[PDB]
Design a protein around this ligand. Structure first.
Ligand SMILES: [Zn+2]
Ligand SMILES: [Zn+2]
Ligand SMILES: [Zn+2]
Lengths: 100, 50
């Protein structure tokens, strides 16, 4: 109807999760840099920060009850190899880099 | 500079409007339920058409 099998509201959600996942990867260093810097400008990244520590060691993927783990684990595997061309995930992320 | 920056993610948060989040929804990229980069192979017509 509105698009093919691979392009529903779940892909709009991967674009949202991608940004939180990449922020979480950076944000995890701010606390380690001093030991008590718990503050953040986007508190919602805590969900990804917790999930990253799980998915980096998890192996239950096809049946892992943590939906966010199997979800986030697939995003970087796609992005890393897709970088050679334009894509709904890779294109906005590449364009954002112009800001600093 | 050769990689992404935390303020570049903050710029994409503002571009997308993610500052308005409240609860994170679910997805199943590790299952057939959402094969995020597949093709429109599901196109078919029921046995009642025969
Ligand atoms: Zn953060
Ligand atoms: Zn898991
Ligand atoms: Zn891509």
């Amino acid at each position: 109807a509105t698009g093919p099998t691979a392009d529903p509201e779940k892909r709009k959600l991967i674009q949202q999760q991608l940004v939180l996942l990449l922020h979480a990867h950076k944000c995890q260093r701010r606390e380690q840099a001093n030991g008590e810097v718990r503050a953040c400008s986007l508190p919602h990244c805590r969900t990804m920060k917790n999930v990253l520590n799980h998915m980096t060691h998890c192996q239950a993927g096809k049946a892992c009850q943590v939906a966010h783990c199997a979800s986030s684990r697939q995003i970087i595997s796609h992005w890393k190899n897709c970088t050679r061309h334009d894509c709904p995930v890779c294109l906005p992320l590449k364009n954002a880099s112009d800001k600093r | 500079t050769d990689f992404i920056d935390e303020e570049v993610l903050m710029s994409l948060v503002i571009e997308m409007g993610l500052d308005r989040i409240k609860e994170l929804p679910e997805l199943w990229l590790g299952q057939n339920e959402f094969d995020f980069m597949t093709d429109f192979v599901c196109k078919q017509q029921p046995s009642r058409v025969s």
